[PDB]
């Protein structure tokens, strides 16, 4: 899962 | 069951500011972003910015730009966002809308607070 | 900015009837990203990354394109489809939408 904007990895 | 529950309509002078909030409930508030999209009569829909949590800071559409602050209080799971400068074009509904992930949709969206400026 | 214009702004068409609205990009974007929304409603997910069904969503809907150009396509017509339809991009910053089309119902 990569954050729309900022592009953050959260799995 | 994911909720974005915004503040209600506002009537704001010329020149004054508005700062809407969004409580954010059923998800990890800090694992996605808030996003604030506005409807304004003139045009469909506008991405003013946004923020994501874990990064101190916020992005804004260069439009909005030194005009709009958007903030987080990460221990209410509030997003909020703030207009300043408000003119008659600022007339809007405003909605806060989850930024999940980059390969789907703005996923859920706050019912929207319309802010007038008048005087 | 990636500019995102929406053909037609507005259609009528009957209950089963098959509709297209396209969605075309200034510049090409990785894909787009449909809503819907239903007047004094906040807009809902539709189509995710051009082709993906949003959650709930019925099997009538269904999106194609790439590059700058792209559709949304509403098989069979039914009357709660009266809404207004969005494209939108975030391959590049600031993200857009279309201007929205409005889809309305012939009975």
């Known amino acids: 899962r990569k954050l729309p904007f900022s592009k953050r990895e959260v799995p | 069951e994911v909720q974005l529950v915004q503040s209600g309509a506002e009537v704001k002078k010329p020149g004054a500011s508005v700062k809407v909030s969004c409580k954010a409930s059923g998800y990890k508030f800090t694992d996605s972003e808030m996003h604030w999209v506005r409807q304004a009569p003139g045009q469909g829909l506008e991405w003013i910015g946004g923020?994501?949590?874990?990064?101190?800071?916020?992005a804004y559409n260069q439009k909005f730009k030194g005009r709009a602050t958007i903030t987080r209080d990460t221990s209410t799971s509030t997003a909020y966002l703030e207009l300043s400068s408000l003119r008659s074009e600022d007339t809007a509904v405003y909605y806060c809308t989850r930024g999940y992930d980059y390969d789907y949709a703005l996923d859920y969206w706050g019912q929207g607070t319309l802010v007038t400026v008048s005087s | 900015d990636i500019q995102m214009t929406q053909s037609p702004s507005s259609l009528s068409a009957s209950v089963g009837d098959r509709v297209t609205i396209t969605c075309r990009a200034s510049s090409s974007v990785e894909f787009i990203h449909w809503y819907q929304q239903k007047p004094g409603k906040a807009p809902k997910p539709l189509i995710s990354?051009?082709?993906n069904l949003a959650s709930g969503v019925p099997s009538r809907f269904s999106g194609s394109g790439s590059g700058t150009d792209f559709t949304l396509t509403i098989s069979s017509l039914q009357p709660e489809d009266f809404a207004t339809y969005y494209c939108?991009?975030?391959?590049?910053?600031?993200?857009?939408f279309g201007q929205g089309t409005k889809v309305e119902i012939k009975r």
């Open positions: 990354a051009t082709s």
């Open positions: 923020v994501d949590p874990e990064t101190e800071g916020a």
């Open positions: 939108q991009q975030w391959s590049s910053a600031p993200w857009t």
